Design a protein around this ligand. Structure first.
Ligand code: CL
Length: 312
């Protein structure tokens, strides 16, 4: 039986990964900052039924915290840029990876890092000063998916210097459903054209602009891609993971028609109807990975998830 460590198992990407590794027959160790917070870890507890799951207290600042959950594991998965519901992240990454240098069992470290995820978190912010023209004439920084965060740049140099086999996976706007109690922000952004939430619609516009694109994947495709590049020995480097590319206005038309039951706005004025960028997942697809979910499917599950959360 093989063992994998997933850091920060209460996250959106990380909890689903734990689940999928359990179903694939891995034993899984996961770390949470405080396991006694029973509301926070409830979904992890539920995963114990699926198999050999062990939950360790560990802290990203610490770096002696990681020796125990990582002991005996073949793979260590860490999400650097988790989705909400910089110097900390850089430091977490080096710290997990330092621990990994001492654990001779570790075959590969798999890091989740997206400059887009940082922008997505910031786009759904607080204290935004809104006026009469602000709300149309659209703080968040640039989130081009192909850009390397400093966290990521750190990992590659550390890996280069310490003979660690590192792979990075680069997701963009993730939707579908979550195992977490709170709704991840990414799903809110994605589902804004359906809820009609103008604030998060403005978010999606901001993303087209600051990310150069409106690209999307089901979180479950993103998690399977992590397991795939872990297991496939000749895999290397970085892997962008997204299923579909679009623009907000092109997307809104698509969803208008697929979901006539909902008041989907289609008139965007002179807002750019083509994005500057198309984000390609061809490298991942050529390694042998197939996406199980297309845009139709990403939205159905998200809709059903939003219903059950009483948001539709
Ligand atoms: Cl996440």
């Amino acid at each position: 039986k093989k063992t994998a460590c997933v850091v920060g198992g209460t996250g959106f990407v990380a909890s689903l990964l734990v689940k999928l590794l359990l179903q694939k027959g891995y034993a899984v160790n996961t770390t949470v900052r405080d396991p006694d917070n029973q509301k926070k870890v409830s979904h992890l507890l539920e995963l114990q039924e699926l198999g050999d799951l062990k939950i360790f207290r560990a802290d990203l600042t610490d770096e002696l915290s990681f020796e125990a959950p990582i002991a005996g594991c073949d793979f260590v998965f860490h999400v650097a840029t988790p989705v909400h519901f910089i110097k900390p992240a850089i430091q977490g990454v080096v710290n997990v990876m330092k621990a990994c240098t001492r654990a001779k069992s570790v075959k590969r470290v798999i890091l989740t890092s997206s400059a887009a995820a940082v922008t997505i978190n910031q786009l759904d912010g607080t204290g935004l000063v809104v006026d009469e023209k602000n709300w149309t004439d659209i703080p968040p920084t640039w989130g081009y998916p192909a850009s390397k965060t400093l966290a990521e740049k750190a990992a590659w140099k550390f890996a280069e210097e310490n003979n660690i086999d590192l792979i990075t996976v680069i997701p963009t706007l993730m939707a579908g459903s979550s195992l977490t109690s709170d709704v991840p922000s990414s799903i809110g952004l994605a589902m804004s054209l359906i809820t009609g939430n103008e604030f998060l619609i403005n978010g999606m516009k901001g993303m087209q602009m600051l990310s150069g694109s409106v690209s999307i994947a089901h979180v479950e495709d993103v998690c399977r891609a992590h397991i795939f590049v872990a297991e496939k020995e000749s895999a290397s480097g970085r892997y962008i993971c997204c299923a579909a590319n679009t623009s907000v206005p092109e997307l809104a038309k698509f969803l208008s028609k697929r979901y006539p039951q909902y008041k989907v706005p289609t008139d965007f004025g002179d807002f750019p109807p083509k994005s500057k960028l198309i984000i390609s997942s061809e490298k991942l697809v050529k390694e042998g990975f197939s996406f199980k979910y297309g845009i139709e499917e990403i939205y159905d599950e998200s809709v059903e998830y939003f219903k059950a959360k009483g948001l539709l």
